[PDB]
């Protein structure tokens, strides 16, 4: 039981933050195309 689980997170969230920070550390040659292919546009109703 990791710490963020005690905090109340979920592996969907842990994975978003992690996949995000790995996208920022990308060099700018790849940072744009990799933020496009992995962005979110859905909206809850």
């Amino acid at each position: 039981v990791a710490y963020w689980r005690q905090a109340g997170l979920s592996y969907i969230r842990y994975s978003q933050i992690c996949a995000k920070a790995v996208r920022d550390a990308l060099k700018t040659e790849f940072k744009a195309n990799a933020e496009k292919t992995s962005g979110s546009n859905v909206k809850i109703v």
Binding site: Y3, Y14, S15, C18, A25
Partner: protein, 132 residues
């Protein structure tokens, strides 16, 4: 004997390939997988992933999160959410963002938000450590 499968939401690095060994950064500590390995299933944390082809050559990637599943028929399925080769990353942005998150951690006060800071902290620390 091992049929590997390393993929990402948009890229298939391997598919049924016959490799000899695979190193993965599981949330319960790393471990390397060979043929006939005991069946297991785990979820990953930020870290390297090294693949040893039968010819003794080693490919290195970097996965951010995902899931691993070694199976009874020696078939591995490694599905990473964001898989990048090592050379697509830079050390400066890694160290820079590590400081900003460390700065926000000492500044934060709420439990949940602090965990998200820490999650991004360990995200970067594994970045700088894996890079160089």
């Amino acid at each position: 004997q091992m049929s590997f499968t390393f993929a990402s939401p948009t890229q298939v690095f391997f598919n049924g390939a016959n490799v000899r060994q695979v190193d993965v950064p599981t949330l319960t500590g790393a471990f390397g997988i060979l043929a006939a390995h005991v069946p297991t299933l785990q979820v990953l944390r930020p870290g390297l992933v090294v693949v040893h082809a039968e010819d003794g050559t080693t490919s290195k990637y970097f996965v951010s999160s995902g899931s691993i599943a070694v199976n009874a028929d020696s078939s591995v399925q490694l599905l990473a959410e964001e898989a990048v080769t090592l050379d697509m990353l830079d050390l400066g942005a890694a160290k820079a963002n590590l400081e900003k998150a460390q700065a926000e951690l000492v500044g934060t006060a709420d439990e949940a938000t602090r965990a998200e800071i820490q999650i991004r902290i360990e995200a970067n620390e594994a970045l700088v450590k894996a890079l160089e």
